[PDB]
Amino acid sequence: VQATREDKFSFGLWTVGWQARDAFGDATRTALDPVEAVHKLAEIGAYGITFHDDDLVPFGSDAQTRDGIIAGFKKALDETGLIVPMVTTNLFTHPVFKDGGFTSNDRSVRRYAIRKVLRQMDLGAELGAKTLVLWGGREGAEYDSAKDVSAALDRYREALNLLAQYSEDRGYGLRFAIQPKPNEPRGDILLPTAGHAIAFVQELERPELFGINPETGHEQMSNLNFTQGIAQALWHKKLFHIDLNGQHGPKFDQDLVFGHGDLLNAFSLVDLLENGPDGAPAYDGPRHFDYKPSRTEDYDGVWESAKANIRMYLLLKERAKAFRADPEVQEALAASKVAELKTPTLNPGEGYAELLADRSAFEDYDADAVGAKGFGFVKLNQLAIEHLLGAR
Amino acid sequence: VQATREDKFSFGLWTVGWQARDAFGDATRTALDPVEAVHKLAEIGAYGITFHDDDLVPFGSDAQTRDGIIAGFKKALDETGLIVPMVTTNLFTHPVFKDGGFTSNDRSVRRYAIRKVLRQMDLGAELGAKTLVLWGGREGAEYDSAKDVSAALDRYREALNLLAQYSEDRGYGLRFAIQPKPNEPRGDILLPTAGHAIAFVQELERPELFGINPETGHEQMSNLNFTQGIAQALWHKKLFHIDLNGQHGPKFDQDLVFGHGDLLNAFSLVDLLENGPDGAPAYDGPRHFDYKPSRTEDYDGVWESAKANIRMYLLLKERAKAFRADPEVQEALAASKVAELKTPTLNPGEGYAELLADRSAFEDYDADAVGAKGFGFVKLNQLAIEHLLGAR
Amino acid sequence: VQATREDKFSFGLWTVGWQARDAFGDATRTALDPVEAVHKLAEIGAYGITFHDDDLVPFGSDAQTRDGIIAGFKKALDETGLIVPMVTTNLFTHPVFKDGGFTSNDRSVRRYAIRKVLRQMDLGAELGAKTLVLWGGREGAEYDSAKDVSAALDRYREALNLLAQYSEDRGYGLRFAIQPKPNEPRGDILLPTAGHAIAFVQELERPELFGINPETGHEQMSNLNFTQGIAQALWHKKLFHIDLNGQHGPKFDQDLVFGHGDLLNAFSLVDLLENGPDGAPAYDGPRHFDYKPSRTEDYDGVWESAKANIRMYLLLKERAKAFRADPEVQEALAASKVAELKTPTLNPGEGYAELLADRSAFEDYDADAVGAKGFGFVKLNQLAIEHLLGAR
Amino acid sequence: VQATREDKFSFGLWTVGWQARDAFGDATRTALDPVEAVHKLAEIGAYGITFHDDDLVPFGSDAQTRDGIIAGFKKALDETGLIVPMVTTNLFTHPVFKDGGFTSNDRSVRRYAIRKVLRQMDLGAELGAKTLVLWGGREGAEYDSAKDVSAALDRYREALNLLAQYSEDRGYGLRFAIQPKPNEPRGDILLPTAGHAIAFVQELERPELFGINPETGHEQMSNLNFTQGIAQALWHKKLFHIDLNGQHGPKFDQDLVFGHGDLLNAFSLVDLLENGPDGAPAYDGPRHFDYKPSRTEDYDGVWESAKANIRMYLLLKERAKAFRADPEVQEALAASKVAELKTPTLNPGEGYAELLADRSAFEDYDADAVGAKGFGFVKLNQLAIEHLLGAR
């Protein structure tokens, strides 16, 4: 197939730009020029590009340089038609953030971190970004007695309340998306799952401005069901953005191409995002790829891997639609009573009083006869997979 | 040490009463009489006993039979002085619940599930229980297409709103605590971690009546930090109850004695609960043990294991107390800046305008000098362990 | 695609016959009659059936009874043309085996364990079985001080040496296949991975008679690469049998249909077993399915799930073949140097003296230049996945 | 507690020398001078130091430089009395090794990796090292079709056979220790566990010169029981060296101080190594710490962490000793029949025929009666933890 701008495929500058310096070895690729990145991505079908302040402008660039870089970057966008849907801030690389940005034990670091973000907000607003992604990669601990979690949540909240305040006052219209991750680089990161992140956001001052940006690999690092977590995020209406990639369970963060890790779950995820109610997608934001071209690859492998992300999503989309359109699947869905879950448990107007009065719901209920009937889930699963294999 | 009623140690009837029939073998123990369990627990120092409806009254007992059991039960409670702080309902054993209770795809099962729970609420309220624990062990799926999560959350919420209503109307004054679990017995369980359950609870009609009942091993099954998740539950003020046990990371649910799994996390958990703010404990509900005496043991091993739970908690408590009263530990805390996280990042009355104005927060900030100072976290962790080891 | 006797699909009596009584609920299916099982399996295309002693003859049947059952069973075999390629012994269900069979701390249980297996060997010999599978499910511990691992290995070895002696004296011609599992039902099981089992077998008196029977799901419970461990087993020539099923990482043993867990790894496994050395399979034994029909299914679900196992294998086989026959794949394989690994590092007759004399292997070697060339592994992976999805 | 040279504590130069550049941030510490490291370690009680060729001599130093560095290093060992018990080679950092050393698909890289190692062998022999540790960090893959495992094992073997030939011919008297790791940095590494490494070594030309160097965190990354795995290595007599550190289950490689991860397992481990047969340790080699001072620390934190390792080991030893010496433990050990596993299952000269004629081993055996006696394992376990806690 072919990607259109309506597919809304976006990529971070740090994805195709990863030089491949891992925890155990040196970089295997030279630095990627941002203008070239813009050009290369425009060519493969991306509709937008994202970045961390520091991916674009080298940490400690004088005003002249910074200004210089931005203007060249704006031209490239101009020329290519790519947009900047989201921007983020690097609060994890520099040694000053070793104990965190917003929740560093050191108060001076917290103040500095806020300033660094305000500044990226400005650039973001100027480039037309709608979302500010916040990844607290250094928020956490290696040792339990080293971090007061309650105080850290207070400080995290305190910093976000301020960012919302500023954005609203400057009229930036940004939405904020917290990105949860269980560990790496800290032994344990605060807001470890999509769940914890949603619960937190609900405690902010203007909760309507905050949501989450879950990443496939992060939930899988804890062996959780990504599709199921996204289904909950959508239920809450907190899916502000999504990062797609691949992972092979609980181990270091792999950042593989989307669909190169848990293929079955990548299939069900695409199905959930696209085969939304009223035919339409359940999610309309950017389909952002936060992945890394393997260290064994050169620049050709890099563009090949960028294209693979798009091809995987579109191939899966195609099979998810065929799946839902199959009359035999329709028959299996019915036998499994998937849609019966959408009908309220109670009849309209019934409350506990009427439920208590219904002998058929308890006193005369034959639990044994109901318990003997199967749901036909295995057959339904087998049909889904045969659709994925293109065998039907 | 010896346990006092003030310690509030409670056990489920199903813990010391587990007959040890696992997934691969027959029971190794004969059934425990509930009255006998009441007497034995009182004798080891428990202050309360809890139970699932089906633990006390065999599924399908006629009313005469059920009435008799309840009366003998109440007599034992009376005579021993034990209380019933929480009650729960078995919505997972009978074949009828193979696809869940409140969220089964089958509508009639959902109606029956609610009635089973309402009936248990009556019995709980009559025994004086203050909390109703909800463990949706069968709410979930083995295959992604078999369950509409959104519809499932709607149905879950629909059942919970009804229960709150009934309780409030009857003046039962119950609090509801959802118990999260990632998997087992379903491939994936809905509301998999404490975070997911908290975010869900926030969407109910009367959220103030709802909290969580997190279990040590359950969060460890996802390799998450239990103490850190408890800290967040406390920050939200949703820790209504707690289940203590042991686990060895991601594998089947072991239900070992508390402290027999991740000892270091058990230590930091007791520190968090007892050395709360203002000298006093941060948590005041029951310290409930939801564990299982190993299948290799006989009734002597069962009582030994019940006592081991209490000993474990008291030994860790003593060490946590000594830890904090150690001037060397205090000095390390000060050097690590733990308490400085409790100081607002912003000055009183300071807003973004003033922050933007502070050149010491950015323009004149020496990130490099700050970045080079060590936090002394290792030394702090070492003192903590020397206290646990009784080496200090 | 349809199954042939040549495909060698076999199933354990205990797979389709699993009543779905799990660690948290009652059985949802009635007992399956063995003669019935033989007939149904013959019908779906199985070439053979396997069983534990206790699956066929209920624990403690008198000889008359036992004798009667065997006679009926052999008749069913006869009529359908099904063989018994492997047999095993239940050394895990009965309470006497709570601390192990061959490695129980209790000497009398160890003696009894051996007698139970000798007895099963005679029956297997009688039915024409070629392999004796040994799954030491109760060998291991919950606590480190409870089991002397060294002594346990001595006793595991003592028992196996005896079994081989007996088989060899009697002329049974059996091969012995140890089945590794990391945990469940015990906290930790002895010989936890394919590797631990192979290393152990190398220490027996007649090692040539011993190999392993690895199970997809068991290696995945530790997050290991199943295909890669099978490759090592084949390298050692110790792959005597294989148990296929599905699993979703580290959690309780799921026993899903083959290919319903890690699909990518199911694909690479079929490629490995089938696209062997010549053109011929690299493995010639039974393709045994050790799975469980989900607890939510009735007998229609049971037969559907049996067929799904065969269907997944044949579908993956078909795509593995197509993958290897593709010119574009051939090209990608050439660019990634997969086949260059098969060429010795040393030239014929070269030793350390000649290597040391080669300035080009070190002194004049341009490591920087070589390190800059890409392997094109992502592209190769992408072609494989597209073959799997029937996209090419 | 004080460390003596008889304790044999060793540290890798790359441990205290780790500059704390992780996968997400820059170094937080400056480089450590080898000579200084030597003086500092001597000072905290270590008996020896180890290093990777590239840790001591910067990759690509001329012989003049190389020679100079070796001379100074040699002086420091001289003055301090420290020895070099083991050396290793860096076959993972440089980009050329992106697909492995010995198993790179590129033939030239394979020739080069061997040369790199022969050279390091020379230096090792000159400094008196007795063990060559091989950590195949880059041997493996991210994608199944990219690496022919069988060909890889052949090439791994070919390289090792040459190394042993050379050492034996030059009369170096080295022992080779393969260090297993499941993943990181490759998606999956060849020889993922202690078990796989042991099986592989058994296939070499001179297997008696080869063993393993297992690391605590490596086995825990797969959630395996490190103590039980060491016990197996000991049973095989392949424990040639051991790397101690801490880890919190399946996640990135943490490399915490020994005992700061799974503390209960750290305890059973010291017990296994020290309370060997007849008072004497079961293991005699170096107790090497392969850990990293947390990224949040400065040089102060670095030395602290170095001493914490020694401290942890000595405190555990002390408690393991006391545990075993306790008559109450001695009594519990007897009741649990731990030592009965040491008695052969068979009587002297007893074979299959005598066992088949023994009616007490089967026909007249009361499995139900034996199945009901408890093993008293929880109680023994509780005694161990009370000893660890200093409460006994």
Side-chain angles (χ1 to χ4, degrees), chain B residues 10-63 65-277 279-284:
Chain B
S10 40
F11 291 86
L13 183 53
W14 69 90
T15 73
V16 294
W18 183 58
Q19 287 182 267
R21 172 187 85 64
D22 60 25
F24 303 77
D26 299 334
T28 67
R29 290 188 293 266
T30 53
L32 177 65
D33 173 293
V35 162
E36 196 190 327
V38 168
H39 290 110
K40 285 280 192 181
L41 290 169
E43 168 160 330
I44 76 189
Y47 103 119
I49 191 151
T50 69
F51 62 96
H52 293 81
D53 45 357
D54 303 335
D55 297 333
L56 188 67
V57 183
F59 182 96
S61 278
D62 52 88
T65 300
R66 171 161 195 280
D67 283 354
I69 291 147
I70 294 154
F73 191 61
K74 303 212 273 190
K75 186 195 189 191
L77 291 173
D78 234 273
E79 290 185 1
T80 65
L82 239 59
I83 63 160
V84 175
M86 172 280 268
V87 299
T88 192
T89 323
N90 185 317
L91 299 178
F92 51 84
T93 299
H94 188 283
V96 77
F97 299 126
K98 71 191 179 197
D99 186 51
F102 298 152
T103 69
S104 175
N105 276 0
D106 183 308
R107 193 167 183 256
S108 78
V109 177
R110 306 199 291 272
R111 294 168 66 81
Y112 172 76
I114 300 175
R115 295 289 305 278
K116 202 174 185 283
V117 177
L118 295 164
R119 189 185 203 203
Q120 179 68 344
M121 287 172 63
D122 292 340
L123 177 58
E126 173 191 328
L127 293 169
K130 265 145 202 173
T131 312
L132 177 88
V133 157
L134 300 132
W135 173 56
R138 300 281 177 191
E139 315 313 316
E142 284 66 63
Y143 316 104
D144 295 332
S145 58
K147 181 73 31 174
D148 179 327
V149 171
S150 194
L153 292 176
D154 277 346
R155 305 284 72 80
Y156 212 144
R157 164 163 62 195
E158 178 182 17
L160 293 192
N161 283 345
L162 186 155
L163 307 182
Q165 199 51 90
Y166 180 65
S167 174
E168 294 290 285
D169 285 5
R170 305 284 274 100
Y172 284 173
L174 289 166
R175 276 196 322 179
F176 306 87
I178 299 336
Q179 183 174 76
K181 199 188 196 177
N183 65 242
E184 197 192 34
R186 302 308 304 270
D188 290 295
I189 294 176
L190 295 178
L191 310 181
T193 77
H196 301 72
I198 292 168
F200 169 78
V201 135
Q202 304 167 327
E203 305 288 350
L204 298 182
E205 205 181 81
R206 277 145 127 339
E208 63 289 347
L209 298 181
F210 290 94
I212 62 159
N213 176 40
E215 176 170 302
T216 317
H218 294 186
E219 305 289 303
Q220 290 172 173
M221 285 168 66
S222 297
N223 201 42
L224 295 174
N225 186 317
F226 188 65
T227 302
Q228 297 183 355
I230 294 299
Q232 172 173 358
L234 283 176
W235 181 77
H236 282 110
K237 289 164 158 157
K238 294 305 195 174
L239 186 71
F240 280 16
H241 193 267
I242 196 168
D243 284 350
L244 307 168
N245 69 4
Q247 176 63 29
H248 291 289
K251 61 172 80 173
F252 72 101
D253 189 10
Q254 300 195 261
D255 289 330
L256 301 171
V257 159
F258 173 66
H260 291 193
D262 178 346
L263 183 52
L264 290 182
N265 200 260
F267 173 63
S268 72
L269 172 84
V270 174
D271 178 47
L272 179 77
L273 300 181
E274 302 303 331
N275 294 317
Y283 165 75
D284 61 274

Side-chain angles (χ1 to χ4, degrees), chain A residues 346-364:
Chain A
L346 305 166
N347 288 311
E350 214 191 348
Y352 65 77
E354 295 77 15
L355 186 63
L356 280 172
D358 185 3
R359 286 185 54 89
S360 84
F362 191 79
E363 304 72 6
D364 300 327

Side-chain angles (χ1 to χ4, degrees), chain C residues 188-277 279-387:
Chain C
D188 299 285
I189 298 178
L190 294 188
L191 311 178
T193 74
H196 300 72
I198 288 163
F200 169 80
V201 130
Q202 297 163 331
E203 309 282 350
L204 305 177
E205 202 194 6
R206 294 164 221 257
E208 63 287 350
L209 292 189
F210 296 87
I212 60 168
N213 175 42
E215 178 166 301
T216 313
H218 297 177
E219 293 311 293
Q220 300 175 161
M221 285 170 69
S222 299
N223 209 33
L224 292 182
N225 188 312
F226 185 69
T227 303
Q228 299 190 352
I230 298 307
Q232 177 173 349
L234 287 167
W235 184 72
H236 283 109
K237 289 157 177 153
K238 292 291 176 193
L239 184 67
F240 283 12
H241 198 269
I242 202 171
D243 275 355
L244 307 168
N245 65 7
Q247 175 73 28
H248 293 287
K251 46 176 72 165
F252 70 100
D253 181 18
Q254 301 189 263
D255 290 337
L256 305 172
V257 164
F258 174 63
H260 286 199
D262 185 340
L263 184 60
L264 288 186
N265 207 256
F267 180 55
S268 66
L269 176 73
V270 167
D271 176 43
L272 178 74
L273 305 178
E274 298 309 328
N275 301 326
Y283 166 76
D284 65 294
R287 275 72 167 159
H288 188 245
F289 300 106
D290 183 0
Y291 87 112
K292 282 171 171 80
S294 288
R295 193 171 178 266
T296 61
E297 307 307 291
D298 53 19
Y299 273 106
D300 291 319
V302 168
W303 304 115
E304 268 292 330
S305 79
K307 292 171 203 210
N309 280 287
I310 287 164
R311 186 120 185 95
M312 288 303 304
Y313 198 105
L314 294 182
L315 293 169
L316 297 170
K317 181 182 170 180
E318 183 195 344
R319 297 157 163 72
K321 302 271 165 200
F323 166 66
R324 295 278 178 192
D326 176 6
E328 265 203 63
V329 163
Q330 287 314 309
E331 179 178 328
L333 289 165
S336 298
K337 288 179 189 266
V338 180
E340 194 165 300
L341 194 66
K342 297 173 177 171
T343 299
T345 297
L346 302 173
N347 290 307
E350 211 182 6
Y352 63 79
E354 297 74 20
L355 186 65
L356 288 169
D358 183 6
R359 282 187 52 96
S360 76
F362 188 79
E363 302 76 354
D364 302 328
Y365 192 62
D366 194 0
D368 292 331
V370 183
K373 310 150 155 195
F375 280 94
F377 290 146
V378 180
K379 172 181 203 168
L380 169 70
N381 191 54
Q382 182 69 23
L383 290 172
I385 297 181
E386 298 187 13
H387 270 278

